[PDB]
Design an enzyme around this catalytic site. Structure first.
Site, PDB file in Angstrom:
ATOM      1  N   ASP A  83      -1.239   5.666  -5.318  1.00 51.63           N
ATOM      2  CA  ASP A  83      -1.777   4.789  -4.196  1.00 51.63           C
ATOM      3  C   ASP A  83      -2.109   3.365  -4.626  1.00 51.63           C
ATOM      4  OD1 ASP A  83      -2.709   3.707  -1.957  1.00 51.63           O
ATOM      5  OD2 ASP A  83      -4.531   4.982  -1.783  1.00 51.63           O
ATOM      6  N   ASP A 121       0.855  -1.195   0.000  1.00 51.89           N
ATOM      7  CA  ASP A 121       0.000   0.000   0.000  1.00 51.89           C
ATOM      8  C   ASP A 121       0.893   1.249   0.000  1.00 51.89           C
ATOM      9  OD1 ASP A 121      -2.076   1.850   0.345  1.00 51.89           O
ATOM     10  OD2 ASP A 121      -2.487   1.388   2.464  1.00 51.89           O
TER      11      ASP A 121
HETATM   12  C1  1HH Z   1      -4.859   1.624   4.786  1.00 54.28           C
HETATM   13  C2  1HH Z   1      -5.684   1.889   3.513  1.00 54.28           C
HETATM   14  C3  1HH Z   1      -6.483   0.664   3.137  1.00 54.28           C
HETATM   15  C4  1HH Z   1      -6.361   0.093   1.891  1.00 54.28           C
HETATM   16  C5  1HH Z   1      -7.110  -1.056   1.556  1.00 54.28           C
HETATM   17  N1  1HH Z   1      -6.982  -1.527   0.244  1.00 54.28           N
HETATM   18  C6  1HH Z   1      -7.599  -2.596  -0.324  1.00 54.28           C
HETATM   19  O1  1HH Z   1      -8.391  -3.269   0.309  1.00 54.28           O
HETATM   20  C7  1HH Z   1      -7.347  -2.809  -1.775  1.00 54.28           C
HETATM   21  C8  1HH Z   1      -8.313  -3.443  -2.579  1.00 54.28           C
HETATM   22  C9  1HH Z   1      -8.046  -3.543  -3.955  1.00 54.28           C
HETATM   23  C10 1HH Z   1      -6.850  -2.962  -4.460  1.00 54.28           C
HETATM   24  C11 1HH Z   1      -6.518  -3.047  -5.857  1.00 54.28           C
HETATM   25  N2  1HH Z   1      -6.257  -3.122  -6.959  1.00 54.28           N
HETATM   26  C12 1HH Z   1      -5.964  -2.338  -3.578  1.00 54.28           C
HETATM   27  N3  1HH Z   1      -6.275  -2.275  -2.308  1.00 54.28           N
HETATM   28  C13 1HH Z   1      -8.031  -1.649   2.482  1.00 54.28           C
HETATM   29  C14 1HH Z   1      -8.143  -1.080   3.749  1.00 54.28           C
HETATM   30  C15 1HH Z   1      -7.371   0.066   4.062  1.00 54.28           C
HETATM   31  F1  1HH Z   1      -7.487   0.608   5.294  1.00 54.28           F
HETATM   32  N4  1HH Z   1      -4.801   2.235   2.405  1.00 54.28           N
HETATM   33  C16 1HH Z   1      -5.192   3.063   1.479  1.00 54.28           C
HETATM   34  N5  1HH Z   1      -4.363   3.337   0.425  1.00 54.28           N
HETATM   35  O2  1HH Z   1      -6.417   3.620   1.424  1.00 54.28           O
HETATM   36  C17 1HH Z   1      -7.158   3.881   2.627  1.00 54.28           C
HETATM   37  C18 1HH Z   1      -8.611   3.510   2.373  1.00 54.28           C
HETATM   38  F2  1HH Z   1      -8.815   2.220   1.931  1.00 54.28           F
HETATM   39  F3  1HH Z   1      -9.308   3.755   3.518  1.00 54.28           F
HETATM   40  F4  1HH Z   1      -9.118   4.256   1.359  1.00 54.28           F
HETATM   41  C19 1HH Z   1      -6.591   3.098   3.835  1.00 54.28           C
HETATM   42  F5  1HH Z   1      -5.759   4.038   4.418  1.00 54.28           F
END
Ligand code: 1HH
Ligand code: NA
Ligand code: NA
Length: 371
Positions: free
Chosen positions: A221, A37
């Site tokens: 991201d 991430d």
């Molecule tokens: C930590 C955090 C986060 C990412 C995911 N991410 C996927 O579950 C996923 C799913 C599919 C793909 C693809 N392709 C990537 N990630 C899930 C929970 C999270 F808690 N990271 C980011 N960047 O965004 C924030 C947010 F989600 F809240 F928006 C949040 F900070």
């Protein structure tokens, strides 16, 4: 440098569940799959038997675990986790041949965080201390790796949209891309924040004050699926995509990601759908370059039913896996710049491919950043 065969193909994923890498924590090593991430800065792993988890970190089995005696509570728009902070030995088996003492948030309670049916149990936040929780004194994983080893201060990502790809820690692998890399300055080390200077839908400018493109930030991201655009820009963007494609009709809810659209197998007409061009601030005064994505990126298959994967945002532009899957993306932290090149694995067709070109002359690029 330039060649890291042990690291190629070290990521896995299921469509829409993200890309994860194998990591080990503690002594003896406990193997965990961990979401890559670039939009957060905590290394946070399941540490309790939540029913969704294939496995979880069991601190009691680790002789090298050190408790920091300090809790963390982390809400997001949907969902949240709370955990216990401490440190332990961490390696990446298909990454550099090193072991570091890194902070780890052991997640003890979560809501709408883990995905039911996914194969990952934690998240590796690769961004900077400024957005670590509880505060910027909890050193992120990548900072610890660089401080404790001779691993160079950069990593690069090739996301291939059963997903896979490569995270190259400490270098670039030239087999992962074609043509040249072009670099955009990391405007501030918190998220990987960048500046979009112009947006074109099939080579027609949205013609907005470019401050609109980065209101209140734009970031790269890997932990988000969509290309997200500030509301005002999203509204202009679909209006222009609707116009480009109206040679066929879709329900309107479609464009808000409120319903799916389907064609019968192998009929999807990609040729109606326009390319989307983002111009990013370049390394040189008055110079930009541009990255061009395909409908193949912004129409995601739902397992022929696609979802529209651009969406409005109130947190600014988010260049998610929608963008990154066309490109090899180099997070060149040592020089505060993000490189883009055409990915040697991106999804494309006979008529069009993704593109990275420059230089273009763009004046007043500094006006485009939001304050
Ligand atoms: C930590 C955090 C986060 C990412 C995911 N991410 C996927 O579950 C996923 C799913 C599919 C793909 C693809 N392709 C990537 N990630 C899930 C929970 C999270 F808690 N990271 C980011 N960047 O965004 C924030 C947010 F989600 F809240 F928006 C949040 F900070
Ligand atoms: Na070092
Ligand atoms: Na190459």
């Amino acid at each position: 440098r330039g060649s890291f065969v042990e690291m190629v193909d070290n990521l896995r994923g299921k469509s829409g569940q993200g890309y994860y890498v194998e990591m080990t924590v503690g002594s003896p090593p406990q193997t965990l799959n961990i979401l890559v991430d670039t939009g957060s800065s905590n290394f946070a792993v399941g540490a309790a038997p939540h029913p969704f988890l294939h496995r979880y970190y069991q601190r009691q089995l680790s002789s090298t675990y050190r408790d920091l005696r300090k809790g963390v509570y982390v809400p997001y728009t949907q969902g949240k986790w709370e955990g216990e902070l401490g440190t332990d030995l961490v390696s990446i088996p298909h990454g550099p041949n090193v072991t570091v003492r890194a902070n780890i948030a052991a997640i003890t309670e979560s809501d709408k965080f883990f995905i039911n049916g996914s194969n990952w149990e934690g998240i590796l936040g690769l961004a900077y201390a400024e957005i670590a929780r509880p505060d910027d004194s909890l050193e992120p994983f990548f900072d610890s790796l660089v401080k404790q080893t001779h691993v160079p201060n950069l990593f690069s990502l090739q996301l291939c949209g059963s997903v896979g790809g490569s995270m190259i820690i400490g270098g670039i692998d030239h087999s992962l891309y074609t043509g040249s890399l072009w670099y955009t300055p990391i405007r501030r080390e918190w998220y990987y924040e960048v500046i979009i200077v112009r947006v074109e839908i099939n080579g027609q400018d949205l013609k907005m004050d470019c401050k609109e493109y980065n209101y209140d930030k734009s970031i790269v991201d890997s932990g988000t699926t969509n290309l997200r655009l500030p509301k005002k820009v999203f509204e202009a963007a679909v209006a222009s995509i609707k116009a480009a494609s109206s040679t066929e009709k879709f329900p309107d809810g479609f464009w808000l990601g409120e319903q799916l659209v389907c064609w019968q197998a192998g009929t999807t007409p990609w040729n109606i759908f326009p390319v989307i061009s983002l111009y990013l601030m370049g390394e040189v005064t008055n110079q930009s370059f541009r990255i061009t994505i395909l409908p193949q990126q912004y129409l995601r298959p739902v397992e022929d039913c696609y979802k529209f994967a651009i969406s409005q945002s109130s947190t600014g532009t988010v260049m998610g896996a929608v963008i990154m899957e066309g490109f090899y993306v180099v997070f060149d932290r040592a020089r505060k710049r993000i490189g883009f090149a055409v990915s040697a694995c991106h999804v494309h067709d006979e008529f069009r491919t993704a593109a990275v070109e420059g230089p273009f002359v763009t004046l007043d690029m500094e006006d485009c950043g939001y304050n």
